[PDB]
Amino acid sequence: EHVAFGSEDIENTLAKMDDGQLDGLAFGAIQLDGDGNILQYNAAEGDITGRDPKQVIGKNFFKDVAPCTDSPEFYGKFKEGVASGNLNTMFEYTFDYQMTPTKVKVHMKKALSGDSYWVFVKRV
Numbered sequence: 001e002h003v004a005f006g007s008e009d010i011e012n013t014l015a016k017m018d019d020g021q022l023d024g025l026a027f028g029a030i031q032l033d034g035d036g037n038i039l040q041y042n043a044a045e046g047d048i049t050g051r052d053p054k055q056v057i058g059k060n061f062f063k064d065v066a067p068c069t070d071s072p073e074f075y076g077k078f079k080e081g082v083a084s085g086n087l088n089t090m091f092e093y094t095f096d097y098q099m100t101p102t103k104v105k106v107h108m109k110k111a112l113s114g115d116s117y118w119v120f121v122k123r124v
């Protein structure tokens with residue numbers, strides 16, 4: 001898929017893309033509901049983190065999968081965005097739960113329709 005990390009209209013491009021198409025992206029992509037449950041999780045993300053995508057779909061990202069993100073610096077930003085109904089933030093972070101610590105750039109953006117939220121990830 002021909003989409004760049006951080007693209008201004010990424011929510012339109014990805015809107016309603018199915019799991020197979022998401023697996024074509026150059027960067028990790030996770031779709032979360034407003035509670036942080038995982039709705040979609042692509043192959044590039046699994047390559048970065050070791051998680052098996054179909055296994056983490058339905059789990060809570062903050063509670064279960066990624067406790068290192070349960071902090072004001074990641075989850076706090078996410079929940080503020082869910083509560084506001086608007087989110088577009090980009091920041092670096094280190095992923096380190098049961099994995100070699102890995103520095104990444106994270107872009108969280110509210111999905112176009114409904115109430116879903118993207119978490120995009122690339123190595124830095």
Ligand SMILES: *C(=O)/C=C/c1ccc(O)cc1
Binds near residue numbers: 030045051065069
């Ligand atoms: C910290 O616990 C981060 C873990 C993590 C981040 C992103 C993922 O897709 C999976 C686990």
